[PDB]
């Protein structure tokens, strides 16, 4: 049971789940809640959330963080298997440090 555990989260507007619900299964799981931006991993959102392009949403994008659903947490929590594989479909966005190890500067 280390799934989150590995990595930072952040959660930004309401989520599937409420407020004593969220933050006691994100860190059971070993999931924290960081109060940053791009030091958090993937960030907690809905498309509705997306969709409306706020300036939070900007910073996410501006910090380089993809942003999956709530339900991700459940997706783990249930089932169990490859991590990319979950971020493959789950995944609201196609962002989020995508290049680790290359040089695009000039």
Known sequence: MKPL???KILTLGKLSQN???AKAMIEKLGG???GSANKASLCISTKKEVEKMSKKMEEVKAANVRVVCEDFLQDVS???KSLQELL???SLSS???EV???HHHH
């Open 5 to 7: 555990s590995n990595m």
């Open 19 to 21: 407020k004593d619900e």
């Open 32 to 34: 924290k809640l960081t």
């Open 78 to 80: 249930a089932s169990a």
């Open 88 to 90: 493959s479909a789950h």
């Open 95 to 97: 962002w989020g440090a």
């Open 100 to 102: 680790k190890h290359h």
